[PDB]
């Protein structure tokens, strides 16, 4: 059986449309979650707001809505990557836009009323990427939640990857990297690539500040890399044999930091079958980012499970760290919300 959890609810399902590519964002101070996804016939991005009530151990989700401004004319919108700027009280949604040779665009919308309304999009593509743009076939952000650092500038870090046209007889090769802003998203720089054949990724900060990057790969195991200079360079990287990737070219997964009961630990979710996208597991790194220290997975959901996104939700009703998880289930017929505590998942680590 799978781990007892506080809540398991389908929050998007196939209907008139298909739902994929989840992203989850906790809003501290609001006891609220935003759950985003692509609404495909890709076309648009939709959002549901959930209010978390601890005494009933549950989130009540409001009605789904299109993020009408997260779009460019004649383009499909993909890869919702949200971020909450603690310093401003501003909500960011990053996304890519592709027309209905590199033609992919990086976009941002912004909200100051917690996601109820949104600015008109800004196209960041030229200023963020620059001459490199023509050396890529395409690129993406996230998908999923991004990162704010507690450096002086409270920098914004958007995980990403680009397919680089490195040798003309070879097909393009993907490498992960981060977009970086030090002025609250007014300007953007491209950090340096991690390593050949890394795809979708996410980043988390631990403590010496370290940004840990966890990425999908072509191999049978995850790639993880670490930056000591806040995402500009992931000076080191390697395979993480304890973290399996299934055929043919892996699956996206999510990583967050959260405060250590004993200053942070990591939590990571991803399908656990080496053979297929099934059996969503949670894994713990209590000595991060050491790759050796990743635990054995504990089972969060049986059956078909694919992309996920995690959020730290503060303290849970049993007093241990509370987590939210949004994941694609059941051969992509739904996106399910799961809520559970550290005590429930890793009782031996408490
Ligand atoms: C995931 C998927 O594997 O199901 O794949 C993404 C990839 O095709 C990519 O990472 C491999 O290059 C895809 N992203 C885009 C921009 O199409 C996701 O849509 C998909 F869910």
Query: What is the SS3 assignment for 4-54?
Result: CCCEEEEEEECCCCEEEEEEEEEECCCCEEEEEEEEECCCEEEEEEEEEEH
Tokens representing residue 242 in the block: 């304890």
d(CA 113, CA 263): 32
| Residue 320 CA to ligand 1 centre (angstroms) | 34
The reply to whether ligand 1 has any atom less than 6 angstroms from the CB of 307 is yes
Closest CA to 214 of 191, 235, 239, 233: 239
Q: Is 307 a catalytic residue?
A: yes
Q: Which domain holds residue 103?
A: 1-350
Q: Which of 205, 245, 328, 334 is catalytic?
A: 328
Known binding residue 20? Answer is yes
Mutate to test the pocket of ligand 1, among 20, 78, 202, 252 (most ligand atoms within 8 A of CB): 252
CATH code of 1's domain: 2.120.10.10
Residue 16 contacts by C-beta under 8 Å, 6 or more apart in sequence? none
**Around Cβ 302, how many Cβ atoms within 10 Å?**
11
Counted domains in the chain: 1
The reply to whether ligand 1 has any atom less than 6 angstroms from the CB of 78 is yes
- N residues, the chain: 350
Q: Sheet of 334-341: strands edge to edge?
A: 7-13, 334-341, 321-329, 298-315, 278-285, 264-271, 254-259
The reply to whether ligand 1 has any atom less than 6 angstroms from the CB of 76 is no
Phi/psi at 293 (5° precision): -90, -5
Q: Is 52 a catalytic residue?
A: no
d(CA 343, CA 52): 19
């Amino acid at each position: 059986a799978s781990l007892p959890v506080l809540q398991k609810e389908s929050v998007f399902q196939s209907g008139a449309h298909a739902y994929r590519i989840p992203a989850l964002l906790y809003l501290p101070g609001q006891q609220s979650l935003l759950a985003f996804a692509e609404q495909r016939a890709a076309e648009l991005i939709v959002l549901r707001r959930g209010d978390y009530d601890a005494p009933t151990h549950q989130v009540q989700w409001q009605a789904q809505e299109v993020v009408a401004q997260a779009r460019l004319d004649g383009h499909r919108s993909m890869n919702p990557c949200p971020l909450y700027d603690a310093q401003t009280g501003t909500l960011f949604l990053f996304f890519i836009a592709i027309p209905g040779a590199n033609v992919t665009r990086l976009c941002q919308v912004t909200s100051t009323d917690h996601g109820r309304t949104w600015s008109s999009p800004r196209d960041l593509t030229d200023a963020a990427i620059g001459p490199a743009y023509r050396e890529w076939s395409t690129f993406a952000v996230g998908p999923g939640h991004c990162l704010q650092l507690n450096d002086r500038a409270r920098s914004l870090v958007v995980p990403a990857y680009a397919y680089r046209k490195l040798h003309p007889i070879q097909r393009p090769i993907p490498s992960a990297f981060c977009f970086l802003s030090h002025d609250h998203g007014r300007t953007w720089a491209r950090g340096h690539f991690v390593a050949q054949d890394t795809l979708e990724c996410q980043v988390a900060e631990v403590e010496q500040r370290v940004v840990t990057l966890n990425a999908r790969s072509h191999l049978r195991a995850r790639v993880q890399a670490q930056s000591t200079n806040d995402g500009l360079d992931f000076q080191e990287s390697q395979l993480v044999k304890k973290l399996v990737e299934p055929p043919p070219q892996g699956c996206q997964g999510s990583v967050i930091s959260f405060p250590s009961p004993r200053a942070q630990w990591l939590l990571y979710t991803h399908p656990t079958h080496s053979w297929q996208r099934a059996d969503l597991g949670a894994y713990l790194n209590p000595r991060p980012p050491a790759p050796e220290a990743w635990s054995e997975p504990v089972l969060l959901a049986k059956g078909s499970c694919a992309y996920s996104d995690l959020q730290s939700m503060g303290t849970g009703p049993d007093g241990s760290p509370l987590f939210g998880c949004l994941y694609e289930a059941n051969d992509y017929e739904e996106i399910v919300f799961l809520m559970f505590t550290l005590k429930q998942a890793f009782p031996a680590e408490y």
